[PDB]
Amino acid sequence: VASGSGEPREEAGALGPAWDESQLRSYSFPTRPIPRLSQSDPRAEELIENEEPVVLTDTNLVYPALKWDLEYLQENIGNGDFSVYSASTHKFLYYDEKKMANFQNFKPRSNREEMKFHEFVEKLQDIQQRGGEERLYLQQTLNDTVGRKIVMDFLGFNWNWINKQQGKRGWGQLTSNLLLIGMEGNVTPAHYDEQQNFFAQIKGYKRCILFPPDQFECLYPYPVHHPCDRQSQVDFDNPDYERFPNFQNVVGYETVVGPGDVLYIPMYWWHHIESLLNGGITITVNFWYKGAPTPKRIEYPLKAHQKVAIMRNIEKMLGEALGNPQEVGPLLNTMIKGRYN
Amino acid sequence: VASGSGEPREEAGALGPAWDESQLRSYSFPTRPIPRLSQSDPRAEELIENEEPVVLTDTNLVYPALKWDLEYLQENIGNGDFSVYSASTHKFLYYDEKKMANFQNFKPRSNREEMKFHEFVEKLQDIQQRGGEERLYLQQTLNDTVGRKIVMDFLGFNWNWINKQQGKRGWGQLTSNLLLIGMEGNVTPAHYDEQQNFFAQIKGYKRCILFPPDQFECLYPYPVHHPCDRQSQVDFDNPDYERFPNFQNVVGYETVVGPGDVLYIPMYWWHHIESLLNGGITITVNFWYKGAPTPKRIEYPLKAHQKVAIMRNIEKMLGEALGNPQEVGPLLNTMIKGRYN
């Protein structure tokens, strides 16, 4: 039962398969499919409650945006500035700039930049024709500066459903909505977020590979104080098994989302996301919610995500106590060499 | 300059050397001598202040007890119970019984027992003649139950000097005085204490080998939750260099103390103590003081003993947070494998 996203769905009106295997990149690990269910299906509510991924096919979450495309957006999205990452590779590794101080030997593989939507659309058209290899990925939180047409679409989202989801799971507040527009083949390397996420696909298809919190040992996140904190150190395209032995034991949950699908990415779950090759641009809007608070009474043993919370904290504390994050490793090693390993 | 305790001191009245090399056990590491100074010497006050060991030859700290011997003690020490450890080896590894729950696969190498002084003196005489190999070490905090003669000796200690030492170093309170009587050849394996110690030799000679806090990496203490917490895991008689590689880089400060000497053992300093072979029984009384409080403002970088304080705390916290000390190691390893090592 390790097929992956399964047999490519067939579009209504005999419009052919939505995409085919040859558009998916190749990796060294097996994966099983994430369930695709109706939001009225109890099994889906069971998955959301037990914090497991599930693709919801009929939430109508971002019904109003399904009509969005570059042309329409350039038109009414507003005059604000949009963050746009550029890279010479398909991999868009995220790096926290605030943390770039702690690590100087770190050379960003992708540089961010501000611009007006029309400029992004332009730099995009520019590359497209000139046969360029440069890559772009616009990632911008939706704010006040957006057009009224866009604000109307926004109000049109299925708030009744999501708000009830937030209520049912005791989640905290919606912290933001990230608008993501990217070129086909673009890849966001495996990482995990400290929040609950309802990932709404709008245009194009995205293959989503998730790993549960308990595979922390196989994914090897960077040190908490490094800029790529929360991202996996393993290059999925050329895994170094000498440095990352347990990546040979990794198993993912996979799926391909399209216009109308909503992928629940539970807090702490690793996820690798890619826009299909030759699938054209992709558009997604995510909804990030602070997770519920730590229970009054802790039950033992601890869940995997709780142990991850503890490790991050130990790393943060040692960083402040020692007065320098670069000392964390030597201390940690001194503490275990010949004592716990 | 790695001789050790140096040339054996000559006793007053041409009474020959106090002891000779052949009474010292053999070890794989080099050592340099701990300074022997007059307590009126400024260099000694400098060492105590900068927290470095120093043997003080004329404090008159326990002047009144210099006359103590088994006979006299059996006579006036009182009726109380005395803790007495027994072992089939010369090594008396200390183990915290409260912690024996956390580790069941731990089999004590020495068993404690209560008895009246006269009984200890008896079990001692018993072995001595019957040509036994069993070993004994009486270690007992001095309390109310002691005889008036003993209480008079006690009041006779040089409180004026030590109390001023406590005052000068901002130390906390005297927590106890451990009376230690042991058979020649007896060994107390390397460990460190969380308190300041003025170690007063009374009868017999003891070779003291100290290692500074910064050799934590070469001495490999047991995990904080193990019964032998604070003791070194390395068998000094047959060091396992495969498990404890850095023990090949250890360097000690050594000395031999006799009746009248007071060895300042700074808090956190490792110390291995042995009664000379064929030196007859030994008697020592130590004075344990809580160390000064953490400074208002921490200066960076941290001193070695502060990093040791931090590691112990991390281990203690992880133990409670995970609800089980046995999980500390796996968590620690998961946290560093492929991330910090």
Partner: peptide
């Protein structure tokens, strides 16, 4: 305490 989480995202 050590179980407390923060809230970071890409």
């Amino acid at each position: 305490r050590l179980l407390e989480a923060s809230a970071d995202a890409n």
